[PDB]
Enzyme design. Structure first.
Site, PDB file in Angstrom:
ATOM      1  N   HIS A 168       0.979  -1.122   0.000  1.00  0.00           N
ATOM      2  CA  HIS A 168       0.000   0.000   0.000  1.00  0.00           C
ATOM      3  C   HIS A 168       1.039   1.190   0.000  1.00  0.00           C
ATOM      4  O   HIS A 168       2.159   1.035   0.564  1.00  0.00           O
ATOM      5  CB  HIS A 168      -0.626   0.300   1.398  1.00  0.00           C
ATOM      6  CG  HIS A 168      -1.564  -0.814   1.737  1.00  0.00           C
ATOM      7  ND1 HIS A 168      -1.208  -1.977   2.358  1.00  0.00           N
ATOM      8  CD2 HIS A 168      -2.895  -0.882   1.449  1.00  0.00           C
ATOM      9  CE1 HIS A 168      -2.288  -2.724   2.464  1.00  0.00           C
ATOM     10  NE2 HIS A 168      -3.258  -2.047   1.921  1.00  0.00           N
ATOM     11  N   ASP A 204       2.702   1.811   3.295  1.00  0.00           N
ATOM     12  CA  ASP A 204       3.604   0.800   3.856  1.00  0.00           C
ATOM     13  C   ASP A 204       5.040   1.198   3.435  1.00  0.00           C
ATOM     14  O   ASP A 204       5.990   0.914   4.206  1.00  0.00           O
ATOM     15  CB  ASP A 204       3.322  -0.566   3.260  1.00  0.00           C
ATOM     16  CG  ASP A 204       2.016  -1.186   3.531  1.00  0.00           C
ATOM     17  OD1 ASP A 204       1.459  -1.913   2.687  1.00  0.00           O
ATOM     18  OD2 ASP A 204       1.490  -0.892   4.628  1.00  0.00           O
ATOM     19  N   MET A 218       1.824  -6.118  -7.980  1.00  0.00           N
ATOM     20  CA  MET A 218       0.583  -5.424  -7.588  1.00  0.00           C
ATOM     21  C   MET A 218       0.927  -4.356  -6.550  1.00  0.00           C
ATOM     22  O   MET A 218       1.887  -4.475  -5.750  1.00  0.00           O
ATOM     23  CB  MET A 218      -0.322  -6.506  -6.947  1.00  0.00           C
ATOM     24  CG  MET A 218      -1.732  -6.068  -6.527  1.00  0.00           C
ATOM     25  SD  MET A 218      -1.719  -5.349  -4.829  1.00  0.00           S
ATOM     26  CE  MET A 218      -2.154  -6.842  -3.843  1.00  0.00           C
ATOM     27  N   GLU A 230     -11.467  -5.674  -4.553  1.00  0.00           N
ATOM     28  CA  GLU A 230     -11.478  -6.785  -3.544  1.00  0.00           C
ATOM     29  C   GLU A 230     -12.654  -6.587  -2.611  1.00  0.00           C
ATOM     30  O   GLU A 230     -12.737  -5.585  -1.882  1.00  0.00           O
ATOM     31  CB  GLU A 230     -10.185  -6.577  -2.754  1.00  0.00           C
ATOM     32  CG  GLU A 230     -10.072  -7.586  -1.613  1.00  0.00           C
ATOM     33  CD  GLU A 230      -8.780  -7.705  -0.960  1.00  0.00           C
ATOM     34  OE1 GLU A 230      -8.745  -8.425   0.036  1.00  0.00           O
ATOM     35  OE2 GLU A 230      -7.802  -7.079  -1.426  1.00  0.00           O
ATOM     36  N   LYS A 289     -15.294  -7.546   0.616  1.00  0.00           N
ATOM     37  CA  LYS A 289     -15.199  -7.976   2.052  1.00  0.00           C
ATOM     38  C   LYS A 289     -16.607  -7.644   2.547  1.00  0.00           C
ATOM     39  O   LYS A 289     -17.139  -6.540   2.262  1.00  0.00           O
ATOM     40  CB  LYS A 289     -14.041  -7.290   2.766  1.00  0.00           C
ATOM     41  CG  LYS A 289     -13.827  -7.943   4.189  1.00  0.00           C
ATOM     42  CD  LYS A 289     -12.780  -7.153   4.996  1.00  0.00           C
ATOM     43  CE  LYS A 289     -12.546  -7.909   6.330  1.00  0.00           C
ATOM     44  NZ  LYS A 289     -11.435  -7.108   7.002  1.00  0.00           N
ATOM     45  N   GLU A 304     -10.659 -12.770  -1.792  1.00  0.00           N
ATOM     46  CA  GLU A 304      -9.777 -13.280  -0.702  1.00  0.00           C
ATOM     47  C   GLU A 304     -10.425 -14.495  -0.065  1.00  0.00           C
ATOM     48  O   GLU A 304     -11.623 -14.441   0.204  1.00  0.00           O
ATOM     49  CB  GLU A 304      -9.538 -12.203   0.387  1.00  0.00           C
ATOM     50  CG  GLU A 304      -8.594 -12.773   1.417  1.00  0.00           C
ATOM     51  CD  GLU A 304      -8.336 -11.822   2.527  1.00  0.00           C
ATOM     52  OE1 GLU A 304      -8.597 -12.104   3.626  1.00  0.00           O
ATOM     53  OE2 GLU A 304      -7.784 -10.830   2.273  1.00  0.00           O
ATOM     54  N   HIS A 327     -12.407 -13.655   3.180  1.00  0.00           N
ATOM     55  CA  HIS A 327     -13.601 -12.743   3.052  1.00  0.00           C
ATOM     56  C   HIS A 327     -14.848 -13.423   2.552  1.00  0.00           C
ATOM     57  O   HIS A 327     -15.947 -13.139   3.132  1.00  0.00           O
ATOM     58  CB  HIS A 327     -13.243 -11.552   2.175  1.00  0.00           C
ATOM     59  CG  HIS A 327     -12.123 -10.724   2.651  1.00  0.00           C
ATOM     60  ND1 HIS A 327     -11.615  -9.656   1.897  1.00  0.00           N
ATOM     61  CD2 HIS A 327     -11.397 -10.720   3.789  1.00  0.00           C
ATOM     62  CE1 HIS A 327     -10.629  -9.097   2.568  1.00  0.00           C
ATOM     63  NE2 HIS A 327     -10.460  -9.709   3.731  1.00  0.00           N
ATOM     64  N   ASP A 360      -6.158 -13.402  -3.313  1.00  0.00           N
ATOM     65  CA  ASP A 360      -5.550 -13.257  -1.968  1.00  0.00           C
ATOM     66  C   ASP A 360      -5.730 -14.603  -1.222  1.00  0.00           C
ATOM     67  O   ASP A 360      -6.863 -14.972  -1.019  1.00  0.00           O
ATOM     68  CB  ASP A 360      -6.119 -12.171  -1.083  1.00  0.00           C
ATOM     69  CG  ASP A 360      -5.549 -10.839  -1.380  1.00  0.00           C
ATOM     70  OD1 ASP A 360      -5.919  -9.913  -0.736  1.00  0.00           O
ATOM     71  OD2 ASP A 360      -4.751 -10.587  -2.303  1.00  0.00           O
ATOM     72  N   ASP A 419     -12.174 -11.255  10.749  1.00  0.00           N
ATOM     73  CA  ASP A 419     -11.229 -11.656   9.644  1.00  0.00           C
ATOM     74  C   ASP A 419      -9.907 -12.110  10.257  1.00  0.00           C
ATOM     75  O   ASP A 419      -9.128 -11.294  10.749  1.00  0.00           O
ATOM     76  CB  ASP A 419     -11.182 -10.348   8.839  1.00  0.00           C
ATOM     77  CG  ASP A 419     -10.323 -10.408   7.682  1.00  0.00           C
ATOM     78  OD1 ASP A 419      -9.576  -9.460   7.248  1.00  0.00           O
ATOM     79  OD2 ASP A 419     -10.239 -11.526   7.015  1.00  0.00           O
ATOM     80  N   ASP A 475      -7.228 -14.021   8.788  1.00  0.00           N
ATOM     81  CA  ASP A 475      -5.999 -13.921   7.984  1.00  0.00           C
ATOM     82  C   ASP A 475      -4.957 -14.974   8.443  1.00  0.00           C
ATOM     83  O   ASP A 475      -3.786 -14.586   8.590  1.00  0.00           O
ATOM     84  CB  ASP A 475      -5.403 -12.490   8.048  1.00  0.00           C
ATOM     85  CG  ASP A 475      -6.191 -11.495   7.218  1.00  0.00           C
ATOM     86  OD1 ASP A 475      -5.874 -10.299   7.224  1.00  0.00           O
ATOM     87  OD2 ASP A 475      -7.144 -11.907   6.546  1.00  0.00           O
ATOM     88  N   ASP A 525      -2.247 -12.894   1.688  1.00  0.00           N
ATOM     89  CA  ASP A 525      -2.625 -11.695   2.465  1.00  0.00           C
ATOM     90  C   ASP A 525      -2.944 -12.377   3.836  1.00  0.00           C
ATOM     91  O   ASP A 525      -4.077 -12.828   3.946  1.00  0.00           O
ATOM     92  CB  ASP A 525      -3.779 -10.930   1.889  1.00  0.00           C
ATOM     93  CG  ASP A 525      -4.070  -9.739   2.776  1.00  0.00           C
ATOM     94  OD1 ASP A 525      -3.349  -9.331   3.687  1.00  0.00           O
ATOM     95  OD2 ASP A 525      -5.112  -9.096   2.617  1.00  0.00           O
TER      96      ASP A 525
HETATM   97  O1  LIG Z   1      -6.063  -2.861   1.104  1.00  0.00           O
HETATM   98  C1  LIG Z   1      -5.451  -3.982   1.720  1.00  0.00           C
HETATM   99  C2  LIG Z   1      -5.670  -4.914   0.674  1.00  0.00           C
HETATM  100  O2  LIG Z   1      -6.134  -4.450  -0.474  1.00  0.00           O
HETATM  101  C3  LIG Z   1      -6.324  -6.161   1.112  1.00  0.00           C
HETATM  102  O3  LIG Z   1      -6.102  -7.266   0.302  1.00  0.00           O
HETATM  103  C4  LIG Z   1      -6.197  -6.086   2.684  1.00  0.00           C
HETATM  104  O4  LIG Z   1      -4.929  -6.594   3.088  1.00  0.00           O
HETATM  105  C5  LIG Z   1      -7.618  -6.606   2.987  1.00  0.00           C
HETATM  106  O5  LIG Z   1      -7.939  -7.974   2.687  1.00  0.00           O
HETATM  107 MN   LIG Z   2      -6.883  -9.032   1.149  1.00  0.00          MN
HETATM  108 MN   LIG Z   3      -8.728 -10.600   5.317  1.00  0.00          MN
END
Ligand SMILES: O=C[C@H](O)[C@@H](O)[C@H](O)CO
Ligand SMILES: [Mn+2]
Ligand SMILES: [Mn+2]
Ligand SMILES: O=C[C@H](O)[C@@H](O)[C@H](O)CO
Ligand SMILES: O=C[C@H](O)[C@@H](O)[C@H](O)CO
Ligand SMILES: O=C[C@H](O)[C@@H](O)[C@H](O)CO
Ligand SMILES: [Mn+2]
Ligand SMILES: [Mn+2]
Ligand SMILES: [Mn+2]
Ligand SMILES: [Mn+2]
Ligand SMILES: [Mn+2]
Ligand SMILES: [Mn+2]
Lengths: 387, 387, 387, 387
Positions: free
Chosen positions: D54, D57, D88, D181, D183, D217, D220, D245, D255, D257, D287
């Site tokens: 992002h 980051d 990406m 994406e 969610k 994802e 999600h 993802d 969530d 992960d 992810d």
């Molecule tokens: O914006 C963050 C990402 O786009 C995504 O994939 C997150 O990590 C949420 O799942």
């Molecule tokens: Mn994600």
């Molecule tokens: Mn997630």
């Protein structure tokens, strides 16, 4: 047609509720920290009866004995200035990284001893401020994977910790009881004692079961898709409803903590009906979080809504129970019959009674309608004021 | 590398499982009815140890005493011919319309008396055929609306019924224990005693608690999103795991009853690990439904898969616990420490121990990693045979 | 303060709703079958505008052409006697065992051809009786296991079937449109096109997309924990809200089909607010099941409650939107601003606008409260008549 | 029997995954921040092909153009030193308080313009570093209450923003596509475009639909209880699987992960089967979040497990599809027939075909078993290496 709370309504709030800064897993705080003294004053103005706290909400973690006393004196003066009480207190055994694998059930023995010491220090403070209930929410007790925690060993450790706290209270002669608060998950993948049922069952294995009850939360049983009012009736049936956490939740998802009345409104109506009809006399505590979209004005409006919603539901459930048409509907649905013993005549009498089997007309009994939908529509009419 | 069941594995099936005709809320039966004698013979050939039944599966509802005896004699001859046992029996208090509002908690008192009589008649039969456990699934106890059932009254009625059954068994000198099976919903909107926790708590209020345990079902606790192996560890901790229902479920949805191993496979692995390590010695009972898409060949393949899946998981969990690398990982994650008392030294010693508080180094303790992911990957490697 | 439906309210019911005998996965029917003529007459008396049917509800499966015509003539006379209309019709491609693996996506090609023929026969009948919408609920399209259905092949087959039905309607010059109704599971483990979103996306790949829309059901999107009013706003946004199924559901569990207003009451309020404000002009159809605990009196009370609940919610949402204090709250929350284009000035203008980035004061913007809780409490006050 | 990833496997990770400090709604960070350069180096050593980011980051929010260039140069040198790619990139439109009511759909117009500017600035950077896909996760688009967001207005605003981004990319001549994406909730009570279906449907209303696809994802869609592999087959069917993802989730809850392979293992097997058989050629992106119980060693073990689990599942699905006994089972279940057109002969031919209706033997067709359970057990045998 207004609904104003007064201290007599016994409405309480945690410092951590109106004090939530709005930090979530995905975002920074949206509001500045509130001084506990300011929350006490603002809540007193809205009509609350008192506040509750975790040790860490009142005395910042790591404070020397000097700062501790100072934080307490200031709080104490705010309670004296407003007439607010402190009916419950609890310990934070979840924020500091040391608690990453739990407090009472951490795999590391050293952390488990530390957790008990931190708790005992806070029970002394709670008694000093007059709390009658000490809550325990084991948010870090549990796991994300199967091999990380042997649950039988973990319950032995959880029993050991509660039995030592019970020994401490009795040794000191304190008049304080414990209330375990269940949560099925979050922050751990699965939390130990996930529902009111699991917590009630566990209490029966403690050395002095009479010192412990439950502190159920609306949103936590709903996180497991369970019926909140049915769980509360089971806790009342067992004589264990020591305290309650009121809020709203929209289904099985993360713990939302919306203001009371938000979420499942019909469940909120049946819950108020039950608390008032069973004569629950403990505090009506709100464990909620004003959404992070709000500024300070929105925090106060959200807390006021909590109390307002309880008062409106209280009025509608009372009108429902008081309506003669409802009383006839309850008879039509046989609520009266559910309250009578099935066999006060005893086993032998039941075994010799041909009307219970040999001559029982199953088809006639089966054809009798329950009339539950007419009854439920009267309840809906009453909640909506369309009655 | 084959996995053949033998009667020594204690695998059992209800007559209603392989006997399910495939009628669902939206469709007609897809398979003809099976004669109980044929199911006994086919299951014996696959290596099962025995069968279970509801009264109505063996003797059609309404049968005169003459037909009853006939149905029993034929069944008894099939058991003698194959060496199959009958370790558990139960009552159907859910199909007939008379039970539309429940059995033991129906609002109509007459139906509640009838329910007890029908149950007692079946306990006599169960004892005659040698069952050691009598299960009780109150599928119709509950409600679709709030006003239809006062739950405190309903629990009084449920307690009354179980206490009368306990009086009957003791009066007759029978060696049979009861196992309550929880289910959160379906067929009723919400069912009373919805989870293992609710059922364990309720048992503690019965007049003779030692006569009652639980019969948890994999898919039912998963219908509430709960961890099945954690619920079972709580039932073992309490000494109440009297029987178990094995099957698969894919999440919070209608009760699927898929063959064991289907659904949540990792949960199935941890469940087998726990049953085998705790030394559970009761029957390994499958309460499942071969999908209605299947013909008779598919019914038998589904039942054989149930047993096969248990045998494979048993082998993988045993290899997991036996691996020296896993034993070192468990030590690395402190599983050993979770098994030791937190304070065998006692309360006073804990209170005087400065290493538990005053001098506890929270930061050093917090920095210690749990190593749970390495441990979980070893468990995954073992389940998949990639170890 | 009464709420009486009139045919002008456009309330409709399926023959299968008040006609549900009460057979569930665990129990026998509790009510005798209703003659379609009797349901038409009783619904007309309660104020309904019309009825809908599956082919099999009106003409028993297997009827010869002679009995068919007879069943139709009798129905037609009841419609003439009461003034009731038939705005929608559908096909039963789920009850008969032949459909155990689906209709349009069954693995057997022969069954897929049969499914199309059975459907076409019913479209002719629907047009004759004046239906404007033909619904398609593929309840058997899906699977219980991964290898049983290749989904890409299954969507090709589903596209093929809908494209052939579109060819048939256009070839005959009929004025009838199709509405696909999504359901995430039950009776199959997972159903194809599980939500409104999946169904809208699929329609975009049909040869003549303008002939197809959706028939969302309250309880089905709630079976996936989704927000019903948000799904409906997406269907309205796309111009695809052709019909709607109204009922209640309490969360993620089996499909309950409770009367409209039962279940999630706040969702019901926001749904009515949206249908009325967007000007939805199709039928307000109830797809519900009077609980099996009820006799015929309870069936009629449940159907009347459906209409009553819609009328009360309609009044409360209208008072909510009409209140000047609400209109000011909507402005305070910036609902007005959400309705204005973000960049009608165009891309280049946005790129050159320093007020959008370089000089944007993020901290001032972030400090602005949304005032959503004050707004939500006004909505709660309005729903409860505490306003 | 080892499973070593190589850059040829196309495994990628977000900087935010191994870089997650462990801050949750209830706790402080448990790990120190990682320098992006260190993550690039460690991932290259484990065999990853690249990383994603992002904007926030890589370049701390608020950085002047001078610090920006510096952060980029350092990152660029690490990519050159290891051979890692950046396939990406995405924008953070969720952490800063300014985004509390969303980015593209915030009620405040000023914030919506700011959101677009912040995004455009990052697309330029992404192109410079060679990304082929730009993801958009609207985590703050949605609401906690009904009146706070008019969804039709919100979709107009969401369409406007994506259409402006499409105009920008085409105007600049960039070779970059967008992937939305979905969610269903968290952090907002309900998020707009909650599932793959909702996102695919929305894309069909954009001005240049060919520039947009989805980035589904695992966890999600499972948050809505949906079948992940079925959603992915629908995205492949539509030609819209632009990126993916990978992670694990245990059901409908917050969530999680978890690392890929954790969570629903059977779903992971069917997903790998589908990606490999359909020939998906994009990155295999993880992810996930190494649990906060872990130290740095545990972070690296968790990331390595992600890749290992994909490799093992890839081998088992390939052995499954390659087994002659499975190929015969697929024929026995009619998978071959599902792949053939139902009516290549056309509508008129189907209408004149008496074998499709008039003479169709429904009972013979219905009696044919699907043999799905034998097929599913072969798949289970293959996943477990018991084959
Ligand atoms: O914006 C963050 C990402 O786009 C995504 O994939 C997150 O990590 C949420 O799942
Ligand atoms: Mn994600
Ligand atoms: Mn997630
Ligand atoms: O420990 C905090 C409390 O005990 C509890 O009620 C929380 O606010 C979780 O619900
Ligand atoms: O009463 C039937 C049984 O007791 C039970 O195990 C059912 O098959 C429900 O799970
Ligand atoms: O096919 C029946 C209908 O199309 C549908 O609306 C059902 O009653 C399922 O919801
Ligand atoms: Mn909570
Ligand atoms: Mn709480
Ligand atoms: Mn079951
Ligand atoms: Mn069972
Ligand atoms: Mn439905
Ligand atoms: Mn419907």
């Amino acid at each position: 047609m207004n609904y104003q709370p007064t201290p007599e309504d016994r409405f309480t709030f945690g410092l951590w509720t109106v004090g939530w800064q709005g930090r979530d897993p995905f975002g920074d705080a949206t509001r500045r920290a509130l001084d506990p003294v300011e929350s006490v004053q603002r809540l007193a103005e809205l009509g609350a009866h008192g506040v509750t706290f975790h040790d860490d909400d009142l005395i910042p973690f790591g404070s020397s004995d000097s700062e501790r006393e100072e934080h307490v004196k200031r709080f104490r003066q705010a309670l004296d200035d407003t007439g607010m009480k402190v009916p419950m207190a609890t310990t934070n055994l979840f924020t500091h990284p040391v608690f990453k694998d739990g407090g009472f059930t951490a795999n590391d023995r050293d952390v488990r001893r530390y957790a008990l010491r931190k708790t005992i220090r806070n029970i002394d403070l709670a008694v000093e401020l007059g709390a009658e209930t000490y809550v325990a929410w084991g948010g870090r007790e549990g796991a994300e994977s199967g091999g990380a925690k042997d649950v039988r060993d973990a319950l032995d450790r959880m029993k050991e910790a509660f039995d030592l706290l019970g020994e401490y209270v009795t040794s000191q002669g304190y008049d304080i009881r414990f209330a375990i608060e269940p949560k099925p998950n979050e922050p751990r993948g699965d939390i130990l004692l996930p529902t009111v049922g699991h917590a009630l069952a566990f209490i029966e294995r403690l050395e002095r079961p009479e010192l412990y009850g439950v502190n159920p939360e609306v949103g936590h049983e709903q996180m497991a898709g369970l019926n909140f009012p049915h769980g509360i009736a089971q806790a009342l049936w067992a004589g264990k409803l020591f305290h309650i956490d009121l809020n709203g939740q929209n289904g099985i998802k993360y713990d939302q903590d919306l203001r009371f009345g938000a979420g499942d409104l019909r469940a909120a109506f049946w819950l108020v009906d039950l608390l008032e009809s069973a004569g629950y006399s403990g505090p009506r505590h709100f464990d909620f979080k004003p959404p992070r979209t709000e500024d300070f004005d929105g925090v106060w409006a959200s807390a006021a809504g909590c109390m307002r919603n309880y008062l409106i539901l209280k009025e509608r459930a009372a009108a429902f129970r008081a309506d003669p048409e409802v009383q006839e509907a309850l008879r039509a649905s046989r609520l009266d019959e559910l309250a009578r013993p099935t066999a006060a005549d005893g086993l032998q009498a039941l075994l010799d009674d041909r009307s219970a089997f040999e001559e029982f007309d199953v088809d006639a009994a089966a054809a009798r309608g329950m009339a539950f939908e007419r009854l439920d529509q009267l309840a809906m009419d009453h909640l909506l004021g369309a009655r």
